[PDB]
Amino acid sequence: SMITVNEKEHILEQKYRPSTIDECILPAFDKETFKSITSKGKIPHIILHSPSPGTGKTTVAKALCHDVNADMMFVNGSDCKIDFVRGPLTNFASAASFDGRQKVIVIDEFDRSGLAESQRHLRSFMEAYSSNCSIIITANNIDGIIKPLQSRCRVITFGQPTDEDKIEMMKQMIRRLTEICKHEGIAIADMKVVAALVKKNFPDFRKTIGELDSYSSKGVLDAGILSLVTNDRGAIDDVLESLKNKDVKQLRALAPKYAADYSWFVGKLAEEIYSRVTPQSIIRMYEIVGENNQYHGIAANTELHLAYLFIQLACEMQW
Amino acid sequence: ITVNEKEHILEQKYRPSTIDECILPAFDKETFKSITSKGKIPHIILHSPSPGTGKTTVAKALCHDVNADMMFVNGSDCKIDFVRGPLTNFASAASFDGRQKVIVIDEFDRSGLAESQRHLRSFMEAYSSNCSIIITANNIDGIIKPLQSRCRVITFGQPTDEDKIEMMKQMIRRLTEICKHEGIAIADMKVVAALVKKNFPDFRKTIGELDSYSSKGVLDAIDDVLESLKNKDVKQLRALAPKYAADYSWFVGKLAEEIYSRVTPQSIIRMYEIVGENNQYHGIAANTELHLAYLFIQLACEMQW
Amino acid sequence: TVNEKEHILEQKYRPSTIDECILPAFDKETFKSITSKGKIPHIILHSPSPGTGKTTVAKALCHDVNADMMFVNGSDCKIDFVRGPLTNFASAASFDGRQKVIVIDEFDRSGLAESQRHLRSFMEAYSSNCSIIITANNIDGIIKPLQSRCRVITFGQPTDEDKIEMMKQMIRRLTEICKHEGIAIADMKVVAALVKKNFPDFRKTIGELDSGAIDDVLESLKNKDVKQLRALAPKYAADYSWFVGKLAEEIYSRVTPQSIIRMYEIVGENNQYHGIAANTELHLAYLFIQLACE
Amino acid sequence: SLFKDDIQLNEHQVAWYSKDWTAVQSAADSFKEKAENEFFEIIGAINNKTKCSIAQKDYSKFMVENALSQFPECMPAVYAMNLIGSGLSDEAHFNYLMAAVPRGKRYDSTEVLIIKLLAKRYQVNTNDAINYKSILTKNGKLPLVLKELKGLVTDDFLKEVTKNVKEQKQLKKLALEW
Amino acid sequence: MKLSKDTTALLKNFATINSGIMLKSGQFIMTRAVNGTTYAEANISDVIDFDVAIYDLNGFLGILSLVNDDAEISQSEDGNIKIADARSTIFWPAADPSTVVAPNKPIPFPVASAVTEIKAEDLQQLLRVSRGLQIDTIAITVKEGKIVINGFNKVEDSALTRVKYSLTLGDYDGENTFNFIINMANMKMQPGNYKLLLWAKGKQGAAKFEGEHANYVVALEADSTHDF
Amino acid sequence: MKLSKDTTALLKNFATINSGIMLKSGQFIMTRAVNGTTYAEANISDVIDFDVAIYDLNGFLGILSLVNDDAEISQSEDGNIKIADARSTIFWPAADPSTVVAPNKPIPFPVASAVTEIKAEDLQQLLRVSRGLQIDTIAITVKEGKIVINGFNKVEDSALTRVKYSLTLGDYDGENTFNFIINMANMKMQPGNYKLLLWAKGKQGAAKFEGEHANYVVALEADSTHDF
Amino acid sequence: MKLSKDTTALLKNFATINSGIMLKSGQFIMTRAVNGTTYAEANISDVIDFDVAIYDLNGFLGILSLVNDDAEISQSEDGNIKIADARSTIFWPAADPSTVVAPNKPIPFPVASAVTEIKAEDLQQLLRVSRGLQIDTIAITVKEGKIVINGFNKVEDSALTRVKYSLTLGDYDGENTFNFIINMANMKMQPGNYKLLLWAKGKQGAAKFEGEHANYVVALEA
DNA sequence: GGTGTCTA
DNA sequence: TAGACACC
Ligand SMILES: Nc1ncnc2c1ncn2[C@@H]1O[C@H](COP(=O)(O)OP(=O)(O)O)[C@@H](O)[C@H]1O
Ligand SMILES: [Mg+2]
Ligand SMILES: [Mg+2]
């Protein structure tokens, strides 16, 4: 309906992959900058890079082609060794189409280190037939694409929206998750659990639809499941409050609670202590937490090593 | 002012053809006429090091000006297989008439190319009688010592204050003529000499920016982190860290590389302890994004430059 | 039992079976206990005191189970070596239908970390045909998922009863070989003064016949010279964990009270950072100078 | 040669012209600086604080490290590079030492064969295998085991020892003096 | 179904155009290079009696040649392919159609812009010489009232200025200049004689070689030029 | 000694089992794979007149085929091998026995658990097909009153569930189920007809292929089941 | 000119001696290894009608074999080589003579120091065995009243002490010892029977193999 | 150093 | 099959 369904797919983050550029949830400018492209009908050489997965890169690549009725060659970037670029990719950039269809090569996940030579071989190849065929590169890490290549492409960078844009996207994503539940026969009890998914892992709209699949085990999102979404990345308040109060009994007890995922917790901690504390204490909170994080995995008892952080912080932090 | 039509980038499409049309410092220009008059080109390595001065451009034009039979090969491309087949083919394959054979090997300072270099030092002993070699380098140390023996290495750069004054003028005047062919408009002539100043050495850089701005047919990288460490702020650094979490091993390498030059000698000894210790403990560290944040602060504190 | 051709006493007299080894009470019975079932699980035999002859026990358990046995120096067990020879070995059912047992000696060598992880799926892969026996000085050098598929058996603290009885066993055995080797016994307190000199390490004591004190270093630190220290360092690189313990022990008595507080900061800090340190030989050198100074 | 009054033809002409690439390849190889002279070239720069770059050069973190550790004035920096030195760029670990150690002045294969030999014969580690060379060379003098175990030298086995003509020199050495 | 030595001959060839194939019940087989630069179609004497996708078509054909000719290919109980011999039975995997590139339909070829022919031994010389001279691109063009093919080595000569090879197909009646460039890498036709039908509309272009056994359409490169 | 074309035929085959060989004076040759998973033995028509270890047996055989058949192999003055031709003399190195792997003795094969036969062209199809289908393990088992061989690709199918190939050797009289798994890598027998003798005791097992020219014993894999 | 299958056979061989060749109008072709250690000369049935240097002779010959036999090789309008077929025309580059090594003149071979012969299948066994035993140097010498060839592997045996191969050419009448060493790398002769003429003056030496189709001189030392 | 990947 | 490059 208002949502594309690949319908040959059970996997559901992919059953629901947007077919066009409108159905795509993107920042205001990049959507217009993409709308702009599809209207003119001839696509430039683009790099869409995340890094963080799930933002729309390889969906937008396919959509640009759909919307232009491109003659598209989709290609696993890992498979592009230099012989493949000299061979089939050349054979294609050179060919005359004729359906009167603009040719697009989509090289997916082209950010590999050792495809450096295939990359140097494109920098000549991209100009030679830019008349005939345009190249869309998708990457997680752009530094793995050589400069001369970036330089030949418009580099559009995903996943860093403006707070205004960030808000609109979270409204549209929530709206989407709904329309997807509708079609999957999932009943939505609380709507709070659906927005919590959208916020919880935001940049990434894949996990975001992945988490949703995860929770329909009982086909309902009730407050009983809303209780679940709060907990995993949930409130650091109990600790944040005990650090202010500078007491031990509370801290000593809170430490074993978070022993489980230290890598996640320590991240959330630095995040919320940064705002709530003095500028001078920011420089210190990083030395303390950085040093702690750094030595986790050396440390025998992780529960205690976390205790050691808390005291260290209550002493030197001021607010 | 010469145009290679059918060329896309202006830097490819406006490519000074003659050693005269190249914009150069005092001795440097006289030097190449000095050479172009003797009608024969010795074994040469032009090295910049500061880019965009015109290495590869002087190289090609030295061929022109002597009416060479030129073979132009980029350095990334000149390979253990190429030196043996095409290169040898051209040297020993006979052109009748006058033309003199010259093999311009471009950007031959490249990490893995050192074997292709040795193989050529020998080549030069082999084929020098029947052709002559011009290699181009950003860093001469990218070249083996023996190529620096049978090659005359002339070093570019450093125009005298006189030359600066008179080169600027030529890149300003030369910028007008491009824009005349291109149908680009110059709204302010002080804004064109704003660009000939802003990046002065860099003659190649000035032309890419120009393409960029003609969007409306008129005139008006670790950098992000390196800049945030100088500014010693956190909000920026804190935000930049997750960006590079992906490949830490690569990033931390690039970082030590560029901070080494940009910082004080005493801070070099420290930047290594800091980065070395950090790198060392990556893979122990739970949250790699934070562990990278921990590096940045540590660096902004102790680095001074 | 002798192997009457071979060129080395420890090798020529190696106890064939599990009784013939000189061992602790609880330890022999545990090992009897295993071979009793006639099939060997995955085993980690761990020392850490050397010359207690891990690889000898192991070569033995295999013999008591009548298992076809592939041996590997741990140093040599590299990723690809595991991929073909071991897999070649581990895979095939044996015409005679014994158990195939891979003995990997001293798996606590270094960059072998990766071959260790390759092995996690492997060990579950051929369980019927095969078992592995890992030999370690320090368990922390066997990765935890390997520790988990394995019986960890941990060697010896001879009981005072063990002490004496082992001692008589080491005299009547050593007696017996000097017999076969036609070596003369001039005194019978010279035999037993060997069984005592280095006790828990017999493989050692037999290697003396086939021909430590920290004094050399302790003396060089007093003399405060480098040439000697610089040279002594690589000697003890092998077991740092043992040596550093012996050092703090004897320097404690021989030095001033104020220097005791310092010797601990210095050695503690050094010990603490071993395993971070690239070159262990040099890291040991760095200790020696630091000590001679303060 | 068999054509008298030929012209000149240096080593390099003959190679390239005839197109045997082993001579051309060896012709390239001869020109390059000797490893040992590079290792000496470097150590002195850190020390006497003079110019040079690497990456045109063969670099052993070990060597510099070791060779440096020689003077107690260097030892502080050799240490830091020791703990920390892993995963620094060979190039970095260069520049640390450079701006680090202030002043200046400065001043196995065969056995491996024997050892990896001994461990393979008796099925034991490379640790006893050292103690085994010891227990023999002193006592029994062990050419006599070097006699029985000359038997296994197999060509394949040489490749695990070393990578070059240095190996086939060994092949014979041990076929020799026992 | 059973496949004659001629059909498998053909099929081995198609396999060079694309590593897989989609076979549909009928007397017609077709394939297209994944990059869409070369298309082949043929009528065959044997009747294909079930739809099947084959992922490695070269592998499949190798196996076939290890059985007798009467070997009866049929659909497997579980759906894969079953090659049944006198005493032996082989099982080859059917492929998910979504993983094998197939042309959509056989689009009719536009009435020809130019028509000529190429003799079996000339096509052979062209291919063979091509490896030796290193001719990676050819141009069917007009010279002196005749249709000729000119080979060029595009790595060493960018513009297609220096002509390493020339072959004269037949005289040309029309007045039109056309320089039709073809990528050697895309001439996959099995050796034989071919009616050659050239067609162009503006920047679009394609050449259809029409043989006795099959047809091949192959793209003319972007630099082809014409008066059509 | 002199070696006939049949003997060297045999010897070349054994060379595939193990790169070296230990030859002992007599009419009997044997070898075993270094890994002990395959053993071969044959009586030969020629008489070997001296003990010699050959390190590269394939190389030695290549040289032989470069001399006349009457070429007389003997012990060299210094102990190596001397191949003496009409006008020529070749010298090949004798190997230290301690460097080449040999079986101890020819252990008698246990009376067979099961007996069948395999025809020369069926063993050939099996080997040949095997590279094409990528069948790395086979199973001699019972189906519908007949002894069959089933090939499987163990990398893609761990359990040996999907059967890529099946060959029917002959009917089976007994009532026992046996699933005897063999590793393709261990079927080294030279082409020909073979009595096939299967034997198992509990987890132990082996298969002996008995041909006109030689015998091959080869280990059955861990997964092997049976009620024998 | 046109070249018969026999001439191109010959020319392919010469290509193994030297990668290029200098052809001169006439019925006579010749070449020499760049290193001067092996020289070949042959009269051919076809007549070469123009002077031309060919840089890659192997490549040229491969091309030839792709054309009909009647294909007419001629000088190109711009001077390079033009191979003209029935319907097709190929163009191969002429080479600057200064880049290709040719012999000056055929120098008469000195009356032989020693004379023997080598049978076609013995020369074949020698070459073939040579790759397998790794014989990189051979010695024509005297043993027990007969001329023999002894192969050695010079990398593993420096002195030429251990003889891996020996072939007996014929008995030897004279009383002279000569140990004539030859480099396998220089035995380029096409297979066939050869009169073998050995010659030496002091440190100088050469061996001339004289076959039905061509002659080969190849350097020794003694 | 080891392992992996790629281009030669 | 090596050496170049990259990551432990
Ligand atoms: N010295 C110069 N004079 C004129 N143009 C220059 C000069 N240097 C760079 N350019 C512009 O940049 C293009 C390529 O310059 P190049 O010589 O490759 O730069 P680099 O110094 O990095 O080799 C030229 O076509 C030209 O328009
Ligand atoms: Mg993607
Ligand atoms: Mg350039």
Q: Which two tokens stand for residue A292?
A: 């702690």
Separation between Cα atoms, residue E187 and residue B211, nearest integer Å: 40
Segments making up each domain of chain C, as ranges: 1-159, 160-213, 214-294
Closest protein CA for atom 18 of ligand 1: B56
Residue A136: CB partners within 8 Å, gap ≥ 6?
A43, A45, A46, A48, A61, A64, A65, A104, A105, A106, A107
Separation between Cα atoms, residue G120 and residue G194, nearest integer Å: 7
> Is the dihedral angle over the CA atoms F60, F63, F69, F70 positive or is it negative?
negative
Task: Report the b/e string of F48-76 with b at 16+ CB within 10 A.
Answer: beeebbbbbbebbbbbbebbeeebebeee
Resolution (A): 3.2
Q: Which two tokens stand for residue B225?
A: 């982190």
C17 labeled part of a ligand binding site: no
- End-to-end Cα spacing for chain C: 55
Nucleotide nearest to B79 (CA to C1'): H8
Separation between Cα atoms, residue G7 and residue G70, nearest integer Å: 14
Would you tell me which residues have their CB within 7 A of strand I? A 113-114; B 111-112, 114-115, 247-250, 253, 282-283; D 86-87, 163
Separation between Cα atoms, residue C123 and residue B19, nearest integer Å: 71
Separation between Cα atoms, residue F188 and residue F33, nearest integer Å: 10
Q: Which residues pair with E141 in a beta bridge?
A: E148
Phi, psi of E82 (to 5 degrees): -120, 110
Residues within 6 Å of ligand 1 by CB = B 11, 14-16, 22-24, 48, 51-57, 203-204, 207
B136 CA to centre of ligand 1 in angstroms: 13
C-beta separation of B2 from B14 below 8 A: yes
Closest protein CA for atom 4 of ligand 1: B22
F abuts A (3+ Cβ pairs < 8 Å):
no
Residue B85 CB burial class (10 angstroms; 0-12, 13-18, ≥19):
exposed
The full DSSP string for E30-50 is EEE-TTSSEEEEEEEEEEE-S
Q: Please answer yes or no on whether D18 and G35 come within 8 Å at the CB atom.
A: yes
Name the residue among B88, B141, B273 with its Cβ closest to that of D53. Answer: B141
C-beta separation of E209 from E118 below 8 A: yes
The full DSSP string for chain F is ----HHHHHHHHHHHHH-SSEEE-SEEEEEEE-TTSSEEEEEEEEEEE-S-EEES-HHHHHHHHTTS-TT-EEEE-TTSSEEEE-SSEEEEE----GGGS---SS-PPPPPPSEEEEE-HHHHHHHHHHHHHHT--EEEEEEETTEEEEEEE-TTT-SSS-S--EEEEEEE--S---EEEEEEGGG--PPSS-EEEEEEEETTEEEEEEEESS-EEEEEBPTT-EE--
Q: Which two tokens stand for residue E81?
A: 């392919």
Phi, psi of E41 (to 5 degrees): -145, 145
Q: Which helix (H) or strand (E) holds A156?
A: strand A154-157
Fold for B1-160, please state it. Rossmann fold (3.40.50)
Amino acid residing at A7? E
Separation between Cα atoms, residue E113 and residue E142, nearest integer Å: 13
Residue E106: CB partners within 8 Å, gap ≥ 6?
E30, E41
Phi, psi of D174 (to 5 degrees): -85, -10
Name the residue among C11, C278, C285 with its Cβ closest to that of D86. Answer: C278
Distances (CA, A) of D37 to B114, D32, D89: 18, 11, 22
Q: Please answer yes or no on whether A132 and E222 come within 8 Å at the CB atom.
A: yes
B173 three-class SS: helix
Domains C1-159 and C160-213 share a fold: no
Look at chain G and report how many structural domains it folds into: 1
B69 three-class SS: strand
Single out the residue of B1, B70, B7, B12 nearest to residue B207, CA to CA.
B12
The CATH number linked to D121 is 1.10.8.700
Q: C160-213 domain in CATH 3.40.50.10330?
A: no
Strand locations in G71-203 (E):
72-75, 81-84, 88-92, 114-118, 137-143, 146-152, 165-171, 180-183, 194-201
Closest protein CA for atom 25 of ligand 1: B15
Separation between Cα atoms, residue B280 and residue F129, nearest integer Å: 52
C-beta separation of C143 from C118 below 8 A: no
Residue G212: CB partners within 8 Å, gap ≥ 6?
G192, G193
Per-state percent for chain A, helix, strand, coil, to nearest 5? 60, 10, 35
Q: Which of B53, B57, B173, B176 to mutate to test the pocket of ligand 1 (most atoms within 8 A of CB)?
A: B57
Separation between Cα atoms, residue B79 and residue A120, nearest integer Å: 14
C-beta separation of E38 from E32 below 8 A: yes
Number of C-beta neighbours around residue E50 at 10 A: 14
Separation between Cα atoms, residue D38 and residue G192, nearest integer Å: 54
Name the residue with the least CA to C1' distance from nucleotide H4.
A114
C-beta separation of A271 from A308 below 8 A: no
Packed helices B114-127 and D21-31: angle between N→C axes, nearest 10 degrees: 110
Q: Please answer yes or no on whether B144 and D85 come within 8 Å at the CB atom.
A: no
Name the residue with the least CA to C1' distance from nucleotide I2.
D163
Distances (CA, A) of D116 to C6, C136, D125: 17, 20, 9
Strand locations in C200-253 (E):
none
A1 three-class SS: coil
Packed helices B248-262 and B265-281: angle between N→C axes, nearest 10 degrees: 170
Architecture category of domain C214-294 in CATH: Up-down Bundle (1.20)
Q: Which one of 3.30.390.30, 1.10.540.10, 1.20.272.10, 1.25.40.10 gives the CATH number of domain A230-319?
A: 1.20.272.10
Architecture category of domain B227-305 in CATH: Up-down Bundle (1.20)
Separation between Cα atoms, residue G204 and residue G185, nearest integer Å: 19
Residue E62 gets the label, from left (phi > 0), alpha (psi -120 to 50) or beta, of alpha
Q: Please answer yes or no on whether F99 and D150 come within 8 Å at the CB atom.
A: no
C-beta separation of E222 from A131 below 8 A: yes
Number of C-beta neighbours around residue C149 at 10 A: 17
C22 labeled part of a ligand binding site: yes
Strands E146-152 and E137-143: antiparallel
Nucleotide nearest to B111 (CA to C1'): I4
D102 three-class SS: coil
Nucleotide nearest to D164 (CA to C1'): I2
C-beta separation of C8 from D135 below 8 A: yes
Please confirm whether the linkage preceding A53 is cis (ω < 30° from 0).
no
Single out the residue of A274, A60, A27 nearest to residue A162, CA to CA.
A27
Fold for A163-229, please state it. Helicase, Ruva Protein; domain 3 (1.10.8)
Closest protein CA for atom 1 of ligand 1: B54
- As a rounded value in angstroms, the CA-to-C1' distance for C115 and H2 is 10
C-beta separation of C121 from C109 below 8 A: no
A114 three-class SS: helix
Q: Which two tokens stand for residue C136?
A: 């370690």
Single out the residue of G71, D27, E32, B75 nearest to residue A95, CA to CA.
E32
G150 three-class SS: strand
> Is the dihedral angle over the CA atoms E166, E169, E174, E176 positive or is it negative?
negative
Torsion of CA A292, A293, A297, A299, to 10 degrees: 10
Look at chain D and report how many structural domains it folds into: 3
Q: What range does the domain containing F132 cover? A: 2-228
Q: How was this structure determined?
A: X-ray
Q: Note the residue count of chain F.
A: 228
Using beta carbons and an 8 Å cutoff, which residues of F are at the interface with G? 59, 62-63, 66-67, 85, 87-92
Q: Does the beta carbon of E128 lie under 8 angstroms from any beta carbon of chain A?
A: no
Query: What residue spans of G65-199 are helical by DSSP H?
Result: 120-133
Q: Please answer yes or no on whether A88 and E35 come within 8 Å at the CB atom.
A: yes
Q: Which two tokens stand for residue C121?
A: 């799926």
Separation between Cα atoms, residue G41 and residue B106, nearest integer Å: 44
G197 three-class SS: strand
Residue F134: CB partners within 8 Å, gap ≥ 6?
F153, F155, F156, F164
Separation between Cα atoms, residue A243 and residue A269, nearest integer Å: 11
- Which residue is associated with the tokens 């969007």? B215
Q: Which class would CATH give B161-226?
A: mainly alpha
Residues within 5 Å of ion ligand 3, judged at the Cβ atom: B 56
Amino acid residing at D106? R
Strand locations in chain D (E):
none
Phi, psi of C17 (to 5 degrees): -100, -175
Q: Which class would CATH give A1-162?
A: alpha beta
- Which residue is associated with the tokens 């020819």? F106
- In the Cβ-directed half-sphere of A94, how many Cα atoms lie within 13 Å? 26
Which residue, among E123, E166, E171, E193, would best test binding to G if mutated, counting the most G CBs under 10 Å from its CB? E166
Q: Note the residue count of chain A.
A: 319
The CATH number linked to E48 is 3.70.10.10
Q: Which of B203, B210, B211 to mutate to test the pocket of ligand 1 (most atoms within 8 A of CB)?
A: B203
Name the residue with the least CA to C1' distance from nucleotide I5.
A114
Q: Which of B53, B58, B174 to mutate to test the pocket of ligand 1 (most atoms within 8 A of CB)?
A: B53
- Which residue is associated with the tokens 């002779």? G57
- Which residues on chain B are in Cβ contact (under 8 Å) with G78? 96
Mind telling me how many Å the CA of F99 is from chain D's nearest CA?
Answer: 5
Q: Which two tokens stand for residue A274?
A: 């940064």
Separation between Cα atoms, residue B231 and residue A282, nearest integer Å: 16
Fold for C1-159, please state it. Rossmann fold (3.40.50)
> Is the dihedral angle over the CA atoms A115, A117, A118, A122 positive or is it negative?
positive
Separation between Cα atoms, residue A111 and residue B260, nearest integer Å: 27
Number of C-beta neighbours around residue G134 at 10 A: 16
Report how many helices (DSSP H) and strands (DSSP E) chain E contains, helices first.
3, 16
- Which residues on chain D are in Cβ contact (under 8 Å) with F98? 148, 151-152
Q: Note the residue count of chain C.
A: 294
Separation between Cα atoms, residue C172 and residue C191, nearest integer Å: 9
Q: Which residues of B belong to the annotated binding site for ATP?
A: 11-14, 23, 52-57, 204
Q: Please answer yes or no on whether G99 and B91 come within 8 Å at the CB atom.
A: yes
- Which residues on chain D are in Cβ contact (under 8 Å) with F96? 150-152
Q: What range does the domain containing D7 cover? A: 1-33
Q: Are residue D114 and residue D168 in the same domain, yes or no?
A: yes
Name the residue among B121, B126, B279 with its Cβ closest to that of D87. Answer: B279
Query: What residue spans of A216-296 are helical by DSSP H?
Result: 223-232, 237-244, 249-258, 262-276, 279-295
Q: Which two tokens stand for residue E159?
A: 């513009």
Q: Please answer yes or no on whether D99 and B265 come within 8 Å at the CB atom.
A: yes
- Which residues on chain D are in Cβ contact (under 8 Å) with B146? 31-32
Q: Which helix (H) or strand (E) holds D77?
A: helix D75-83
- As a rounded value in angstroms, the CA-to-C1' distance for E184 and I7 is 41
